[PDB]
Structure 1
Amino acid sequence: YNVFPRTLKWSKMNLTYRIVNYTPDMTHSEVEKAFKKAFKVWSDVTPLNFTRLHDGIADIMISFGIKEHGDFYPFDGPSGLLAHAFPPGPNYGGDAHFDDDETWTSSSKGYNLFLVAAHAFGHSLGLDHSKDPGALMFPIYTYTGKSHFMLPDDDVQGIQSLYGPGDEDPNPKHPKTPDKCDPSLSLDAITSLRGETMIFKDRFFWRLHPQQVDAELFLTKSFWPELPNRIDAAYEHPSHDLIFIFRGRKFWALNGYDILEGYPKKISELGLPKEVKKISAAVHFEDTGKTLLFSGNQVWRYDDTNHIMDKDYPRLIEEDFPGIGDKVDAVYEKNGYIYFFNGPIQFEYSIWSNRIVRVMPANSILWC
């Protein structure tokens, strides 16, 4: 997280705001609800208090505007700039302006007013932009899902380094960005995608170029807004530029940023028993047209040519891959080697000699 130079913080704890005007995109009640919610995010973890004024000069004057809207800083029409706010101070200090060329909503569509406002008010209280892609204070908007909003841990620490903690935080365990240097790191799923490793953890993925040592960290929703935050398994069809993503009994096929026509589908369509309730890991072999799918302690092999399950399946992992334990968290394949992830460990399995040839912490895939 980052605070402002000179550490601009408010002096008093009891603060006022005023919704100077409104957008036509939403009713007055919805807008007031969004703004109230946005303030609650910050008040829930600080001694700060917020009060709405219907008339006069408040500390935080909130307005909607379009292009040239009265300051030095015109808005730019649809998308791009969503809003701007000033740090704590007198007059413009604390003020927040919203671009009414955006379509503001209380849903996943257009732009969510509560989300932008919660971000905007972070500035109004003295937080600068964060470099953590998982932080609310990250400079770039991402709809984070209809799930109930939890302030991320980077923002809690930032704001509490300004104003200390509150009496009681309604959920004290705040979402943290995963730490790649932590040797206890376990993974959700892995694939290659256009020659790069995609490593899923929680609502994030790392993308790592083979020529790079520092992975890029994204929110999954940054790439695929209509996909779940957490995924179970991922695999690639490089021939068709397709990635396949599993979560519960659904699965999607993706072409770049696009969900193919017809997806998500049920995994039962793959020929899975109806009692299989998640795929734990998956890997495709293109020189064979065969995909391996893991769940609990079993493997299925799927024929990606003839579009059916192979006959001798399911089999036990303990029979086909002796020594890797009883589950597969995530798996990928490279250069005749299969990489099996089980908790904090990865097993390097040689297809050639049909044995584990190497063992190392899961996080070492991220050069850590």
Structure 2
Amino acid sequence: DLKWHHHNITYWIQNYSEDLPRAVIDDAFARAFALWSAVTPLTFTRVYSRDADIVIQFGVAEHGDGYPFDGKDGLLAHAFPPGPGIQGDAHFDDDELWSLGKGQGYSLFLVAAHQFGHALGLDHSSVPEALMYPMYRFTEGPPLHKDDVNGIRHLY
């Protein structure tokens, strides 16, 4: 039930997934963030310290928190809402097949954006076409839906 008191959010990519090249992943995340910063006064800067607002980590099964991943399929990832400590960090189940665009596997890009929303304070949308819909479904074109934009703007 909290939001970031600053608009200069920072993120730190802790480790990577074995499914994609590092530069591919970095870009994916950058583009994910870019989506929100585009409709809000928010900015996202990549840092290299635990001090980052949002820390990005890929994991398998137990990974620190009490919500370990379910291996292939199922829970794909999860991000904690705004707050101190672990709050804000986004976790990805490196047991999934991460990719982009058409084809098998889940889009790291689209999933990231979704999770970044949660890490910004956004809650799940009730619209099937919105990016904040709790159900993954690949789509082409603008990821954000009127509902997602209104949401993030009602916050920032």
Give deviations 1:263-292, integer Å, cap 9, x for gaps: xxxxxxxxxxxxxxxxxxxxxxxxxxxxxx
Match in the other structure for 1:105: 99
User: CA separation in 1, counterparts of 2:143 and 2:21?
Assistant: 25
Higher RCO by CA contacts (8 Å cutoff, separation 6 or greater): 2
Distance 1:48 1:153 in 2: 18
| SS of alignment partner, residue 80 of structure 1 | coil
Q: Secondary structure at the match of 1:41?
A: helix
Provide the C-alpha distance between the structure 2 equivalents of 1:126 and 1:69, rounded to a whole number of angstroms: 22
Partners of 1:42 and 1:156 in 2: CA distance:
8
CA RMSD of aligned residues (A): 1.0
The equivalent of 1:75 in structure 2 is 69
- What aligned pairs does 1:153-302 form with structure 2 within 5 A after superposition? 153-163=146-156
Q: Tell me the equivalent position of 2:24.
A: 30
After superposition, give the CA deviation of every residue in 1:172-196 in whole Å (9 maximum; x if it has no partner).
xxxxxxxxxxxxxxxxxxxxxxxxx
Aligned to 1:43: 37
Partners of 1:43 and 1:26 in 2: CA distance: 24
Aligned to 1:21: 15
Secondary structure of the corresponding residue to residue 116 of structure 1: helix
TM-score by length of 2: 0.96
Tell me which of 113, 124, 133 is aligned to 2:128.
133
2:119 pairs with one of 101, 124, 130: 124
Q: Distance in 1 between matches of 2:100 and 2:16?
A: 14
Whichever residue aligns with residue 126 of structure 1, its letter is G
Shift of 1:107: 2.6
**For residues 80 and 150 of structure 1, do their structure 2 counterparts lie closer, same or farther at Cα, with a shift above 3 Å needed?**
closer
Q: How far, CA to CA, are the matches of 1:40 and 1:134 in structure 2?
A: 20
Count of aligned pairs between the two proteins: 155
Larger radius of gyration: 1
* CA distance in structure 2 between the aligned counterparts of 1:120 and 1:20, rounded to whole angstroms: 16
Is the Cα–Cα contact under 8 Å of residues 13 and 47 in structure 1 kept in the other structure?
yes
2:155 and 2:14 map into 1 onto residues whose CA distance is: 27
Q: What secondary structure does 1:159 align onto?
A: helix
Give the TM-score taking structure 1 as reference length: 0.41
Q: Deviations over 1:233-254 (max 9, x none)?
A: xxxxxxxxxxxxxxxxxxxxxx
Alignment partners' CA distance in 2, 1:52 and 1:150: 22
Give the AA of the match of 1:121: F
What displacement does 1:132 show? 1.0
- Give, as a single letter, the amino acid of the residue that structure 1 aligns with 2:33: F
Q: Of the candidates 84, 94, 110, which is equivalent to residue 78 of structure 2?
A: 84
4+ residue stretches of structure 1 with deviation over 6 A?
none
Contact 1:30/1:106 (<8 A) preserved? no
Higher strand proportion (structure 1 or 2): 1
CA deviation string 1:127-179 (max 9, x = no partner): 1111111111110100113xx3341100000010001xxxxxxxxxxxxxxxx
**Whole-Å Cα distance in 2 between the matches of residues 114 and 104 of structure 1?**
9
Residues of 2 paired with 1:134 and 1:24: CA distance? Answer: 30
* Aligned mate of 1:55, from 49, 52, 58: 49
Question: Which residues of 2 match residues 345-364 of structure 1 at below 5 A?
Answer: none
Identity of aligned residues (%): 59
State the SS of the aligned residue for 1:138. coil
| CA distance, structure 2, for counterparts of residue 150 and residue 83 of structure 1 | 18
For structure 2, the 5+ residue unaligned runs are none
